[PDB]
Design a protein around this ligand. Structure first.
Ligand SMILES: [Mg+2]
Ligand SMILES: [Mg+2]
Ligand SMILES: [Mg+2]
Ligand SMILES: [Zn+2]
Lengths: 94, 66, 176, 38, 141, 148
RNA sequence: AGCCAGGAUGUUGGCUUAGAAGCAGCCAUCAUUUAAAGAAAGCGUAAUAGCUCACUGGUCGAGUCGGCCUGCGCGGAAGAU
């Protein structure tokens, strides 16, 4: 049920990633299936509130990346070393 | 009575006063009369006699050194 | 807000006389009285007064709220009049009242003789009671306050000048 | 009254007030709880 | 009784109303008459039974004499002479030690019918559950 | 408090007493002690037990939410403090009687007994009641009529 | 939030104590009567007594409560010509 709007990443690398995080965005990646991986950028406070529920990690969930619905599962999360914020997520294609 | 390093053991409520029963050490009852008076506006008899020997608290014991 | 926002009736017989920022209010008894406001906007018309913020004072509202409240007690003041009521406690504690000065005997080596201010007057049902009526709420409070001060109630036998709606401590002494 | 650097409510009746520049504690039940330099 | 005024209850005894170390003086000394609880009590004593726990209230103002009232026995105590064990633990209630009579608890509670709120006399039982799970002593229901 | 799922029960329950009831009284319990309830529960007691109520609710918002049902004579009772009393079995009975006798033992006001519904109206203490079964007052109306 | 009311019965729960009666400790924390009322959140007591709270009924009449993240500030802050 979880609907995650997103955008393809136009910039990659340590430089951009940090920039994103200054603006309450944060990078993540969709990979899996037989098709290429995809570099995503997500709105932070949103995924935070969402991932507050345990279902986030169990349920299949959907990402609307430039109007598609990719539909994936949360593989891995990077939390901040000492804050309550998210750094990065691995999404597996289901 | 408690402050005086004392153990209490009963109360009756004998008629008008209230007899209070306690085991309290000797080296500690000195000048009771004087204060018992202050605490009860002068109206308070009391009485004591020997009962037993019990261990003296350490700081007491090590003080009692001749 | 709320207190600011609530209105306030002007009971039949009262004057009111705004002039800029200077309200004045006469009623039955009471020397009228006159306050000043600042970042408040006072609005007459009607059989009421109403208070609200003036453009450009971040202090507004809080100001209006006070304003409303003050004005109010003036109305209630100059109409019904205000209370008081003190009582002495302690052996040898007299009170007299000659005209507009209370004569107290509070166990000092001299009299006291406290002169009442202006719009306030005093009586003595017993030698151990003082009720003083007046219109100006701010002052009536002050004078009782002054009167209590000559001998604030001590907490061992409660001796001294009391209010009556007071609570007064009281602790067990503990010789010695 | 106690002065301290950390002040905080003690009783359920202690109240906390900012008078002048200074933070305070007033207890209507228990004089021991008055506090300043907050 | 639509107005309380003075009441101190310190469970007395029937067979002889004339204590002295337990109660004695302390049961009557502020406008109360030690002479009349052996004239009056025992007049309401022998009709029932004697010896066992009696809380009580009296009608003394400052009017010299008085009139004595009756009451009812403690309820967790009807689990002593009306159950088994007379203490309640022995192994502090870190251990669930006691032991119950399910048959009893109703009629032995019912004996206290005149001092309870439950309309349903079965309800008056359900109260005695906690009154008798006062230790954690299970009932062989 | 509870949400709606609970403000609805206090309704569906309390209004099916009106829909399936007998008599209604009145009373304002400013000073309502607990020796108060204690007693009146034994009275409900005599008056069956738990056949009776009094569920304080005079939130118009509650025990009027049961009125535009039946007894819309109570849009007028419901203001201020109130203690609504419903009857299921029993005569249109004595319920009436002791409320006046109770509150006339000080036992707080009685709302001047704003009254209620059997008819559709207002106030006045009646024992036009629990004579009920005083059909004997129509048995004695037999032999005495036959003889005299 | 104020203000009026109530804030109860088994019952001093049990244990433990000289006394533990909602309230020193230990274990339990149910059940009644209910509109609601803890086998009790604090004051108090030698212990009871006594005063409150939680909770509910009334009044009132539209907003209100408190955590998370952040910007700038407040106290903390005493020295010698
Ligand atoms: Mg770099
Ligand atoms: Mg100052
Ligand atoms: Mg400095
Ligand atoms: Zn305090």
């Amino acid at each position: 049920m979880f609907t995650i709007n997103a955008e393809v990443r136009k910039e990659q690398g340590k430089g951009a990633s940090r920039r994103l995080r200054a603006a309450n965005k944060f990078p993540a990646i969709i990979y899996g299936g037989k098709e290429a991986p995809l570099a995503i950028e997500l709105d932070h406070d949103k995924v935070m509130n969402m991932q507050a529920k345990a279902e986030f990690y169990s349920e299949v969930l959907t990402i609307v990346v430039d109007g598609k619905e990719i539909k994936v599962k949360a593989q891995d999360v990077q939390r901040h070393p000492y804050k309550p914020k998210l750094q990065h997520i691995d999404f597996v294609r289901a | 009575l408690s402050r005086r390093r004392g153990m209490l053991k009963g109360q009756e409520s004998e008629v008008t006063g209230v007899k209070i029963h306690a085991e309290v050490p000797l080296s500690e009852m000195f000048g009771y009369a004087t204060q018992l008076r202050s605490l009860t506006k002068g109206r308070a008899s009391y009485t004591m006699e020997f009962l037993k020997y019990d261990e003296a608290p350490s700081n007491v014991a090590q003080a009692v050194i001749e | 807000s709320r207190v600011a926002k609530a209105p306030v009736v002007v009971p039949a017989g009262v004057d009111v006389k705004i002039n800029g920022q200077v309200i004045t209010i006469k009623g039955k008894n009471g020397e009228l009285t006159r306050t000043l406001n600042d970042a408040v906007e006072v609005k007459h018309a009607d059989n009421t007064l109403t208070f609200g913020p003036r453009d450009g004072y971040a202090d507004g509202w809080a100001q209006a709220g006070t304003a409303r409240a003050l004005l109010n007690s003036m109305v209630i003041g100059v109409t019904e009049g205000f209370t008081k009521k003190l009582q002495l406690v302690g052996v040898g504690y007299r009170a007299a009242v000659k005209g507009n000065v209370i004569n107290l005997s509070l166990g000092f080596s001299h009299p006291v003789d406290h002169q009442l201010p202006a719009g306030i007057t005093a009586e003595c049902p017993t030698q151990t009671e003082i009720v003083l009526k007046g219109a100006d709420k701010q002052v009536i409070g002050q004078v009782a306050a002054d009167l209590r001060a000559y001998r604030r109630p001590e907490p061992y036998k409660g001796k001294g000048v009391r209010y009556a709606d007071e609570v007064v401590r009281t602790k067990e002494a503990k010789k010695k | 009254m106690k002065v301290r650097a950390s002040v905080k409510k003690l009783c359920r009746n202690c109240k906390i007030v900012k008078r002048d520049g200074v933070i305070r504690v007033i207890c209507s039940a228990e004089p021991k709880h008055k506090q300043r330099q907050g | 009784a639509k107005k309380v005024q003075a009441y101190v209850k310190l469970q007395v005894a029937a067979g002889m109303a004339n204590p002295s170390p337990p109660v004695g003086p302390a049961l009557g000394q502020q406008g109360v008459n030690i002479m009349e609880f052996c004239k009056a009590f025992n007049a309401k004593t022998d009709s029932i039974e004697k010896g066992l726990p009696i809380p009580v209230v009296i009608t003394v103002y400052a009017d010299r004499s008085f009139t004595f009232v009756t009451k009812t026995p403690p309820a967790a105590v009807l689990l002593k002479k009306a159950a088994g064990i007379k203490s309640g633990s022995g192994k502090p209630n870190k251990d669930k030690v006691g032991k119950i009579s399910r048959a009893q608890l109703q009629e032995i509670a019912q004996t206290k019918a005149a001092d309870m709120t439950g309309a349903d006399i079965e309800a008056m039982t359900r109260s005695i559950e906690g009154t008798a799970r006062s230790m954690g002593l299970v009932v062989e229901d | 408090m509870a949400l709606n799922l609970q403000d609805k029960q206090a309704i569906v329950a309390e209004v099916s007493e009106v829909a399936k009831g007998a008599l209604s009284a009145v009373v304002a319990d400013s000073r309502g002690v607990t020796v108060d309830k204690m007693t009146e529960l034994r009275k409900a007691g005599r008056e069956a037990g738990v056949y009776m109520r009094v569920v304080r609710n005079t939130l118009l918002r509650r025990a009027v939410e049961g009125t535009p049902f039946e007894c819309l004579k109570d849009a007028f009772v419901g203001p201020t403090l109130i203690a609504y009393s419903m009857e299921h079995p029993g005569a249109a009975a004595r319920l009436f009687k002791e409320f006046a006798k109770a509150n006339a033992k000080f036992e707080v006001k009685a709302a001047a007994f704003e009254g209620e519904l059997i008819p559709a109206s207002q106030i006045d203490r009646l024992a036009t009641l629990p004579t009920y079964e005083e059909a004997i007052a129509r048995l004695m109306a037999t032999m005495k009529e036959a003889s005299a």
